[PDB]
Design a protein around this ligand. Structure first.
Ligand code: 31O
Ligand code: DQW
Ligand code: CL
Length: 112
């Protein structure tokens, strides 16, 4: 059925994270990490709970998230996985920080 007001805001955020204006740093987060394709054969030994924006989108459409907090925990898990696997100076980490800045500042504008 209809998303709660808070989940509508979350959906708006998700749409923004997937939009062209953020694509320069958001693109690595669009789909699940393909460890074999990228040659990172230790990725799934290190990252026990993969997450990505396509998965968040599917969960939103399927009404998997019961509240905004559950949604935010998944988006933050996605960034945390990036910070866990990669050295802090790597390009993909800089991209994560930038997308997380976009995310956290709009999430903070959550309606009430
Ligand atoms: C060798 O290290 C890697 O390839 C990372 C595992 C990988 N880097 C990258 C990565 C590496 C360099 C740049 Cl400039 C951007 C992303 C990556 C690439 C993608 O291509 C579709 C998908 C996901 C990632 N990603 C995410 C998210 N978190 N870590 C990565
Ligand atoms: C860069 C840190 O990992 C996340 O910072 C969030 C802040 C709102 O930019
Ligand atoms: Cl959280």
């Amino acid at each position: 059925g209809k998303l709660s007001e808070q989940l509508k805001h979350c959906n708006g955020i998700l749409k923004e994270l997937l939009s062209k204006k953020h694509a320069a740093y958001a693109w690595p987060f669009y789909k699940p990490v393909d460890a074999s394709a990228l040659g990172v054969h230790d990725y799934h030994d290190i990252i026990k709970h993969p997450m990505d924006l396509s998965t968040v989108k599917r969960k939103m459409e399927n009404r998997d998230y019961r509240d905004a907090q559950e949604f935010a925990a998944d988006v933050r898990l996605m960034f945390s996985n990036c910070y866990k696997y990669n050295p802090p100076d790597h390009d993909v980490v800089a991209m994560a920080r930038k997308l997380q800045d976009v995310f956290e500042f709009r999430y903070a504008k959550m309606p009430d």
